[PDB]
From Swiss-Prot, chain F:
Protein's name in the database: Uncharacterized 341.7 kDa protein in psbD-psbC intergenic region
Species name: Chlamydomonas reinhardtii
Complete-protein stretch covered: 2778 to 2923 of 2971
Domain of life, source organism: Eukaryota
Compartments where found: Plastid, Chloroplast
Lineage of the species this protein comes from: Eukaryota, Viridiplantae, Chlorophyta, core chlorophytes, Chlorophyceae
Length: 186, 49, 142, 500, 234, 125, 432, 370
């Protein structure tokens, strides 16, 4: 929630729930606005910000609890960050080494996920170059998420304490907590 | 225009559209259960069903 | 179009003299190798492989080669489906045909009779789902 | 819809009029409403009617709860079925079920065992280990997802297994399920030999691999892959019409190079050794449970009596050559499961470390400090055999590198204190290696603007020579040198980093 | 009329949904109406090479006509007449198969020799696949491989994603040996085709110029041109 | 529920309810058989009018059901075209991949370089 | 006789004619009986006896007769039958072959509209707005437990799931003999009795071959019986015969079944290895006696059985591979619901994650080694017991059906001393 | 219940109870050689035999009119004959049948499992250009497939194509159908029946058991005749019950390479035997080809007289010995000698498969420890 709040042009937080009715789950919701982006143009800065927000949960878990206390709750977010990185490298040609080659396409399924991916069978050299670019991008996103949590440590402490005390917090209260305890926007 | 039989069964008999043998489909359903509960999952992003 | 090598190879079948079988094989070999771009003999026949290559070359988007991945069949794909094909609307969409999906597993103690009498057999029995798919495929064929 | 619990209560209360119910009828209706889930109103009316059709041949003055449960079992399972005839194979099946029940009761983080039976109903079923149900989790008010809560809960006890102040992770919690599944084979191997292995204990072994494969690959809580860059190696991109999954195109040689199969084999071998140790130490307990099940009125023992047998029966010596059989004496194969001796062994190479334990600077580090840093970084101390000696050595190197820096060591101690909680928790952990001088270096005032640069400017690793293998790109040079004997490759695993 | 029927049959297999290139002269996207001089020169060279190497191959199907761009189609067409009484509809010999391989590689070898290696167009792909098909049926189906020997390896599984027709289940080492034999047969056929086109270079150039001037040509005019330009037979 | 970003830190309940409560809290007493039955193979014993399975075995009395399991099915759709693992990862026929990619990237780069070199001299325009 | 259904039938006739104790206890009525079981056990005879005991009429009808090409005719017939039942007041309504009409009303095809109408008419005649009540019981007869409609099998229409099966020992006594003809229904029992009157040859007949094929049958069954006798954990031979049946054209050797193994599923690794030996025994003895060039297609199913045993050894975690020894099977291990209740079919999925490329070759090499080493071991055993094999072959050729005691006697008088010492060492033990 | 053997004899005697029959027509052999046929086809066969005798201008003597009457309804209609223009088709569709009959006679010698040849036709009568009829032996000889019988059947399959190759000095497409039949028979030899030496005792880890005809559904109604189906489906026992179908795990690429190498070894041995026979009996084969071209239809009796009149030339010594030499095949058996431990003559296997455990046991316990 902290990285989504400080990330520019991101969706507004709707509700952050940590075990809402004693049910073992936790989520950070966002308002589904029909304006702005929809599907017009995806900026690489927007995609990098989304990937950093996705990696932010596991980066916060590492930076607060330690390396060994992290669990696998961050798997859908890690999947979405990896999908964003692979999409940027292999579908939009945002990598300097792979170049403008269309090796991955998205498609909509006519239940599970609402979409799948048309994949081009690559060779080992092309796959290794694209993997090197994706790993560099993901490590960079992890570093940026770690620094964004590092410069907002008092805000992160306040939000974590409020979540522990109250359970379910509205996005307006999240914004109030962050701005009251002092936050640095990106 | 030549297949090399990479990742399928060697001698797989034809199926209900051609034959009336239900053995390959009965094994294919358990194959799909394997593809659900140890990889892929129900939805994209889930680690195991 | 109005609709043999798998029957004799898998099901035994037979019922063809070894002379007419050989004649059919010789004529098919001659038709596959020769009769390409012939006036009336190799017109549209899908038994000539070069005609099929021409159709693929002129109507399809490249060819795509073999992937180097595991848990996939040949390309970056899994195995094909074997058999190819208010509250009222909610129930109708909830239990209509269920083709692809994935069949659930019953407990080894099974379900007590009522709960087994609900939840259609196509959802848990594998054999029942495959039999239903077979029945629809044969009904579409017939 | 089908009647719920309250609807069941109302229907059975209405249809129980005109029939004699023995004792307090409220308790009988409570039990027969708890024990008839999914039933319809006509089914409840029939069950009430059929009870009164009975008590004529049996000449019972009133309808009672055991007979009510008899018809409840009858109308949904058919015949009562006969018990297994007494034989040497029956005694072996009792021993196998007793070993499975004892290992289930000794598994930390499991639900309480309701009853272990040798005699069951139906046709294709035999002995069983039934756990507590909803109608049992209600009375002792407990969370429905208590099994999921059993990982992070501390200082509790379930069945015969206690959990202290160190919580079980997801990895150790799911990897603890391999021991009850291996105990059936371990009992036969320890008590009879290789030729004593039967088809009775063959089904759990085939699911041990899928549980361990989840533990080491899909769960992403293996200590080897926690320090990796955040790359998803287990991706499948969609399912598509006609249901054909698509592997991630970059995943060329991912499973073979990252050593998933060999790590799964390592976890399975460690769990098999643990099951052999369990059968060795609890041999008399397993024999007593088997005898008590064989000499029971319904060939069924309860969970409380099983726990009483396990706790009362003393721990057998794991030595003494064969463990009622032979060649399983290998059970004396040390253990190699504790991370603290390996860490002390690693720290011994560093000069001037001065280790005391529960007591170039001297750096008088205590066992508490070592355990706190190891739990913060590695995660747990008693999973070394499960994770592999190479993984434990890499973790020990990471813990040593963190211990050499006093600021990092104090931060790790403070965050371990906050994770553990209690009265000693010093509120939130300190700043994440960014001091007040580096945090005041860039608010919206001084410096700033480096966070405005794109992600490539944060690219801290850059190599112009991309390797032919994904392990070299993913892991560091030390990690590839320590690992890659777990890789499933022929002679590439000598052509990969740290060239001799 | 026979040529028109054959071209119409191919055109109603190579335009069914997008098509491209094969039907030139349309006035739409992938079909320039005045077939360019380089393209018609390449088509004439291709068909002249095919006609010359079908003429100099003994015991081959004889040429009835040779046409450059029939139905404004960006390929040539040689009308070959078979002798049904010679080998009924059932007999194929190794001489006939190897001569067919040479004749089918002849067009692309001729356009590679004349127009250069880099200016070869894609009209030689069906004939190249047909020569590859003959070699594949000789090695893997007819058992004419020296190392492969008499074993059946092809099991037709068209049953009608990448469109496989043939399909084989043999091991990787046997597949390597069989495909190496197919490659060496294709290399032998290509070498013989280039040898024939090289030793009959003057006759090939004269036939190319005659095809350019006349558009279509008959069997007797082909024979007269090749015999008047001093052809060398196989 | 359809939110595709929910946090599930553990999956121990899935294994407890699908592999222990469903499967391995119970035991199946139908694993094998003699192999030498009274009607050739088990398929012919099964497709028979006599219930051979139920058989009076004095050697007390009773009619203990001697059942044979169904034939276990083995699905083995593994990959069998492994060619090269030392030096690079290559399956059997991927020989048309390096040439294809080194033509595609080269041609795209050359065209982009030509476009950049043309538009470099027409920036005022 | 009639399994345990007679107590339920007594209950039916008791509350039909003289309720008394049921009315004192407060029970109202059963209103339906669903006789489940295979035909030939007097399913209609029991209902006839129930009607005779209750003093009510019986009208013979089946669900097939309601299937009429005129639309609404079957529903009209069902309604008319129940109207005459209410007029008779009371009687017993029998519906036979309910599996031909009441099955899975989901639609499809131009043959099930009238069938669904008849099922709905039966549903509204058995239940619905109360128009019958009273002392009326409807009995149906099916061969399967739950294949009918959920409402038809609902315990408000057919609330008694009375099951009959083939007669037990006392049932066959009522209708030394029951040891011989144990395991078939009463119709086949009556047919056996009629055949015996027309002639215990009838039991053998209810339960052509030249010299070369008879010799090959004798050699194969003698080798199988000799291996089964000599191997310790293999159960002793019950009998052996070379006379082909109507569906077993190769002769069979039947062993004495192990009650403990069949009840508990304890099939040990040593038993599986010796069962692999016994499966290869027929091929080994045929090759040894008749030469290699006379190897026949008679062992095409013995080879499949041996492959089943070897792959079950590999899949059960009994192999000698260190990564497969006591840890894993071949993987996955999914299960399917078979035809009869309690029966499950096992399907194993092995895909590049449960197995490596070298592990697949290792498993195939281990199965090949198991099969071929077992063949060599059995060939050496039959070579060193050649006199016993020959004597069993000639005795089988003479008698065409020998008992296990004769096999044991021939083996113990003409066996190898080492094999006899092994047999005497591992005797007595019921081998787990 | 269709009549057979004695019932077919009774039906043929009933339909020939008013017509004169020559003694050379073996009624028992005709009844055994027409399996599955009923009176509603044997009446037509006797009818057409009578009409052919009437049109021949004589009484019902010789077996040729009876064989023509059988052929008119087993291989229906009469196509035009092979053209006399060019020497190719008359040579090919005589050489294949001459070689099949010659190999059948040679395997009737020594072994005796191969049944005698009834006739060779080479006159196209429906859906075919040439035939070789085999005198169907008695039943109970077909109820069981023997290893030697299967080897003889593989040799008889390869015989026609290798005889065409020996006659023309050139490979043709006539070997394609023979190879297609012989490969299937060799796969049944190696995998299902287990007659080979794969693994050292012939038991492979995988076998493709045939399925039943009840899964065919279509069931094309050819009817009557009953060809080598009588030897194929009689010994095979199909599956019929999907609940009890065993298919085994599919073998890996390495063991599939070894098993297909065993299949290639069986095919190479049978092919070399057939080529040696046809190389040593070239004179008899050429005399039979000339007689076939001269007289179109020909009986197995007269073929036996011709082959006896042209025997082998004892020892060919030289020049003619060069036909027996180089008649062996150059086809590659990968796992022949030293290539039967783990690489199996594959230079890339060690670069793809990481040295299995039983391979290491073979190379450590047996090798480097003897």
């Amino acid at each position: 929630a902290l990285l989504a709040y400080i990330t520019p042009d991101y969706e507004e937080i709707a509700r952050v729930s940590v075990c809402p009715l004693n049910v073992l789950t936790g989520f950070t919701l966002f308002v589904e606005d029909e304006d702005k982006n929809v599907n017009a143009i995806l900026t690489r800065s927007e995609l990098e910000g989304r990937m950093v927000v996705h990696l932010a949960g596991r980066c916060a878990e590492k930076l607060v609890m330690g390396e060994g206390q992290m669990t696998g709750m961050g798997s859908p977010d890690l999947f979405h960050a990896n999908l964003i990185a692979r999409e940027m490298i292999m579908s939009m040609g945002m990598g300097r080494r792979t170049g403008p080659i269309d090796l991955l396409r998205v498609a909509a399924t006519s239940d599970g996920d609402p979409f799948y991916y048309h994949t081009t069978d690559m060779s080992t050299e092309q796959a290794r170059v694209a993997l090197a670019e994706v790993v560099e991008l993901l490590d960079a996103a992890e570093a940026k998420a770690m620094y964004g949590l590092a410069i907002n440590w008092r805000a992160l402490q306040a939000l974590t304490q409020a979540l522990l005390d109250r359970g379910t917090i509205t996005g307006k209260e999240v914004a109030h907590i962050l701005e009251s305890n002092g936050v640095i926007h990106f | 225009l030549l297949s090399f039989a990479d990742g399928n069964i060697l001698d797989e008999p034809p199926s209900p559209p051609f034959s009336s043998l239900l053995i390959p489909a009965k094994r294919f359903e358990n194959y799909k259960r394997f593809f659900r509960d140890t990889l892929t999952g129900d939805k994209m992003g889930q680690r195991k069903s | 179009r109005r609709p043999g090598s798998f029957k004799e190879d898998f099901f035994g079948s037979q019922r063809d003299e070894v002379h007419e079988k050989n004649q059919v094989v010789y004529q098919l070999t001659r038709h596959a190798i020769t009769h390409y771009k012939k006036p009336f003999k190799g017109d549209y026949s899908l038994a000539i492989p070069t005609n099929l290559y021409v159709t693929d070359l002129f109507l399809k988007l490249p060819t795509q080669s073999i992937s180097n991945l595991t848990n996939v069949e040949n390309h970056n794909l899994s195995i094909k489906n074997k058999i190819q094909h208010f509250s009222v609307l909610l129930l109708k969409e909830e239990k209509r045909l269920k083709p692809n999906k994935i069949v659930e597993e019953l407990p080894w103690t099974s379900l007590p009779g009522e709960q087994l009498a609900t939840k259609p057999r196509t959802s848990y029995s594998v054999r029942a789902k495959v039999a239903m798919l077979a029945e629809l495929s044969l009904s579409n064929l017939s | 819809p089908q009647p719920g619990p309250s609807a069941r209560m109302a229907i059975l209360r209405y249809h129980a009029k005109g029939k004699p119910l023995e004792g307090d009828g409220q308790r009988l209706l409570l039990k027969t409403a708890e024990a008839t889930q999914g039933w319809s109103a006509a089914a409840l009316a029939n069950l009430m009617n059929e009870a009164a059709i009975l008590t004529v041949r049996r000449n019972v003055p009133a309808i009672s709860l055991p007979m009510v449960l008899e018809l409840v079992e009858g109308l949904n399972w058919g015949e009562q079925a006969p018990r297994i005839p007494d034989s040497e194979a029956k005694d072996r099946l009792a021993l196998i079920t007793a070993a499975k029940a004892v290992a289930f009761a000794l598994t930390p983080g499991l639900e309480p065992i309701k009853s272990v039976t040798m005699w069951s109903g139906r046709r294709g079923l035999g002995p069983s280990v039934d756990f507590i149900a909803m109608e049992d989790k209600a009375a002792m008010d407990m969370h429905p997802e208590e099994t999921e809560l059993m990982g992070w809960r501390t200082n509790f006890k379930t069945n015969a297994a206690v959990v202290g102040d160190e919580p079980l992770g997801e990895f150790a919690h799911v990897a603890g399920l391999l021991v009850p599944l291996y105990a059936g084979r371990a009992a036969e191997v320890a008590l009879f030999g290789k030729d004593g292995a039967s088809l009775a204990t063959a089904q759990p072994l085939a699911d041990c691999f899928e549980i361990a494969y989840y533990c080491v690959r899909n769960s992403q809580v293996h200590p080897r892959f926690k320090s990796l860059p955040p790359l998803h190696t287990t991706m499948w991109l969609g399912r598509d019409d006609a249901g054909r999954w698509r592997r991630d195109p970059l995943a060329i040689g991912f499973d073979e190079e990252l050593g998933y199969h060999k790590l799964t084999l390592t976890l399975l071998k460690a769990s098999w050794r643990r099951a052999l140790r369990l059968v060795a130490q609890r041999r008399s307990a397993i024999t007593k449970v088997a005898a008590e099940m064989l000499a029971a009125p319904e060939e069924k023992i309860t969970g409380a009596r099983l726990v009483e047998i396990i706790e009362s029966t003393p721990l057998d010596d794991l030595g003494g050559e064969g463990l009622d059989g032979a060649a399983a004496a290998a059970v004396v194969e040390e253990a190699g499961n504790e991370f603290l001796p390996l860490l002390k062994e690693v720290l011994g190479q560093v000069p001037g470390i001065i280790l005391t334990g529960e007591s170039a600077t001297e750096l008088r580090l205590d066992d508490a400090t070592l355990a706190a840093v190891s739990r913060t970084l590695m995660g747990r101390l008693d999973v070394v055999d499960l994770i592999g000696r190479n993984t434990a050595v890499e973790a020990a190197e990471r813990v040593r590198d963190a211990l050499l820096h006093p600021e990092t060591r104090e931060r790790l101690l403070a965050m371990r204190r906050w994770v553990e909680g209690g009265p000693g928790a010093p509120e939130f952990p300190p700043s994440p290696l960014s001091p007040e001088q580096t945090a005041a270096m860039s608010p919206s005032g001084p410096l700033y603007g480096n966070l405005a640069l794109n992600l490539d400017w944060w690219r801290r690793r850059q190599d112009n020579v991309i390797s032919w293998s994904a392990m070299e790109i993913l892991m560091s040079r030390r990690q590839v040198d320590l690992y890659k004997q777990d890789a499933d490759m022929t002679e590439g695993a000598i052509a990969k980093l740290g060239t001799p | 009329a026979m040529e028109n029927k054959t071209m119409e049959a191919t055109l109603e297999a190579s335009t069914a949904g997008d098509g491209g290139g094969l039907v030139g002269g349309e006035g739409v996207e992938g079909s320039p109406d005045p077939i360019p001089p380089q393209l018609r020169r390449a088509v004439s060279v291709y068909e002249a090479g095919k006609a010359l190497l079908a003429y100099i191959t003994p015991d081959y199907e004889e040429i009835a006509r040779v046409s450059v761009c029939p139905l404004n189609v960006l390929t040539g067409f040689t009308l070959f007449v078979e002798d049904e009484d010679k080998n009924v509809n059932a007999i194929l010999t190794r001489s006939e198969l190897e001569g067919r391989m040479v004749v089918h590689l002849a067009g692309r070898c001729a356009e590679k020799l004349v127009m250069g290696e880099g200016q070869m167009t894609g009209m030689g792909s069906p004939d190249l696949f047909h020569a590859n098909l003959i070699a594949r049926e000789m090695i893997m189906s007819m058992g004419m491989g020296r190392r492969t020997g008499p074993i059946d390896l092809l099991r037709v599984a068209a049953t009608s994603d990448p469109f496989y027709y043939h399909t084989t289940d043999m091991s990787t080492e046997q597949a390597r040996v069989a495909l190496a034999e197919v490659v060496e047969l294709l290399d032998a056929a290509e070498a013989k085709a280039m040898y024939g086109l090289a030793i009959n270079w003057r006759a090939l150039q004269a036939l190319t110029q005659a095809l350019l001037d006349r558009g279509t040509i008959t069997g007797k005019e082909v024979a007269h041109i090749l015999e008047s330009n001093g052809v060398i037979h196989f | 529920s359809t939110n595709n970003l929910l946090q599930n830190p553990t999956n121990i309940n899935w294994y407890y309810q699908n592999r222990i409560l469903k499967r391995h809290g119970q035991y199946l007493t139908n694993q094998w058989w003699n192999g030498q039955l009274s009607e050739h193979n088990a398929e012919t014993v099964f497709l028979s009018d006599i219930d051979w399975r139920s058989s009076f075995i004095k050697n007390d009395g009773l009619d203990v059901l001697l059942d044979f399991p169904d034939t276990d099915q083995y699905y083995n759709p593994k990959r069998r075209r492994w060619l090269l693992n030392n030096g690079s990862w290559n399956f059997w026929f991927n020989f048309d991949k390096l040439y294809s990619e080194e033509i595609v990237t080269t041609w795209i780069l050359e065209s982009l370089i030509q476009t950049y070199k043309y538009l470099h001299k027409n920036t005022e325009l | 006789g009639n399994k345990q259904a007679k107590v339920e039938l007594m209950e039916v006739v008791d509350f039909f004619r003289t309720p008394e104790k049921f009315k004192a206890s407060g029970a109202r009525a059963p209103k339906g009986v669903l006789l489940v079981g295979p035909p030939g056990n007097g399913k209609t005879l029991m209902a006839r006896a129930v009607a005779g005991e209750s003093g009510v009429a019986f009208i013979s009808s089946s669900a097939a007769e309601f299937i009429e090409m005129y639309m609404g005719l079957g529903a009209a017939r069902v309604r008319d039958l129940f109207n005459t039942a209410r007029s008779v007041a009371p009687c017993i309504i029998f519906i036979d072959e309910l599996d031909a009409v009441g099955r899975q009303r989901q639609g499809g095809g131009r043959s099930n509209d009238e069938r669904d109408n008849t099922v709905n008419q039966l549903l509204t005649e058995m239940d619905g707005f109360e128009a019958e009540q009273q002392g009326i019981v409807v009995m149906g007869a099916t061969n399967r437990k739950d294949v009918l409609d959920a409402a038809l099998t609902r315990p408000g229409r057919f609330d008694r799931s009375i099951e009959v099966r083939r007669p037990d020992f006392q049932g066959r006594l009522e209708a030394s003999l029951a040891s011989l003809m144990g395991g078939m229904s009463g119709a086949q029992i009556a047919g056996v009795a009629n055949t015996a009157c027309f002639l215990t040859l009838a039991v053998e007949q209810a339960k052509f071959v030249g010299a070369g094929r008879k010799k090959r049958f004798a050699v194969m069954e003698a080798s199988i019986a000799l291996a089964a006798t000599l191997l310790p954990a293999i159960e002793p031979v019950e009998y052996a015969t070379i006379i082909p049946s109507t569906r077993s054209p190769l002769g069979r050797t039947v062993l004495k079944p192990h009650v403990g193994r069949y009840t508990t599923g304890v099939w040990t690794y040593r038993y599986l290895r010796e069962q692999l030996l016994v499966a290869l025994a027929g091929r080994a003895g045929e090759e040894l006696v008749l030469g290699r060039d006379e190897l026949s297609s008679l062992n095409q199913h013995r080879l499949q059985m041996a492959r089943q045993v070897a792959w079950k050894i590999m899949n059960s975690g009994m192999s000698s591979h260190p990564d497969y020894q006591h840890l894993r099977g071949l993987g996955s291990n999914y299960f399917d619901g078979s035809s009869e209740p309690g029966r499950f079919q096992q399907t194993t999925v092995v895909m590049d994650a449960n197995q490596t490329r070298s592990e697949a070759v290792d498993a195939d090499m281990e199965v090949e080694g198991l099969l071929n080493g077992g063949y060599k071991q059995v060939f050496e055993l039959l070579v060193r017991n050649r006199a016993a094999l020959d004597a069993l072959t000639e005795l089988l050729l003479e008698r065409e059906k020998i008992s296990g005691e004769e096999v044991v006697q021939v083996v113990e008088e003409l066996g190898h001393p080492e094999d006899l010492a092994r047999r005497a060492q591992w005797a007595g033990y019921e081998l787990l | 219940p269709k009549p057979d053997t004695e019932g077919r004899l009774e039906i043929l005697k009933l339909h020939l109870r008013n017509k004169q029959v020559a003694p050379d027509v073996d009624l028992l052999q005709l009844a055994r050689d027409l399996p599955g046929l009923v009176g509603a086809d044997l009446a037509n066969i006797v009818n057409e035999a009578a009409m052919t005798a009437v049109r021949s201008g004589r009484q019902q003597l010789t077996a040729r009119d009876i064989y023509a009457g059988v052929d008119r309804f087993t291989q229906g209609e009469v196509r035009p004959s092979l053209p006399t223009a060019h020497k190719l088709p008359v040579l090919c569709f005589a050489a294949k049948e001459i070689g099949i009959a010659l190999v059948a006679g040679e395997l009737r010698d020594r072994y005796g499992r191969v049944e005698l040849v009834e006739r060779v036709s080479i006159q196209p009568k429906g859906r075919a250009y040439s035939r070789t009829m085999f005198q169907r032996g008695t039943d109970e000889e077909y109820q069981l497939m023997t290893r030697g019988r299967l080897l003889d059947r593989i040799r008889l399959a390869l015989a026609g194509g290798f005889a065409v190759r020996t006659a023309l000095g050139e490979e043709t497409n006539f070997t394609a159908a023979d190879i297609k039949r012989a490969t299937r028979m060799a796969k049944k030899y190696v995998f299902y029946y287990g007659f080979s030496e794969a693994g050292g005792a012939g038991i492979t880890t995988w076998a493709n058991q045939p399925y039943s005809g009840d899964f065919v559904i279509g069931q094309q109604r050819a009817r009557k005749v009953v060809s080598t189906d009588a030897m194929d489906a009689f010994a095979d026992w199909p599956t019929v019950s999907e609940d009890f179908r065993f298919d085994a795990p599919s073998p890996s690429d390495v063991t599939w390479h070894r098993y297909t190498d065993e299949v290639r070894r069986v095919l190479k041995g049978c092919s070399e035997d057939v080529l040696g026979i046809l190389a040593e009996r070239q004179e008899a084969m050429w005399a039979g080809i000339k007689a076939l071209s001269d007289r179109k239809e020909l009986l197995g009796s007269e073929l036996r007289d011709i082959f006896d009149a042209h025997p082998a030339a004892t020892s060919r010594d030289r020049d003619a010995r060069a036909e027996l030499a180089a008649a062996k095949l150059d086809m590659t058996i990968f796992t022949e000698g030293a290539n039967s431990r783990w690489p199996y003559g594959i230079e890339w296997l060690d670069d793809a498969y990481p040295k299995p455990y039983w391979v290491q046991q073979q190379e450590a316990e047996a090798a480097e420890a003897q």
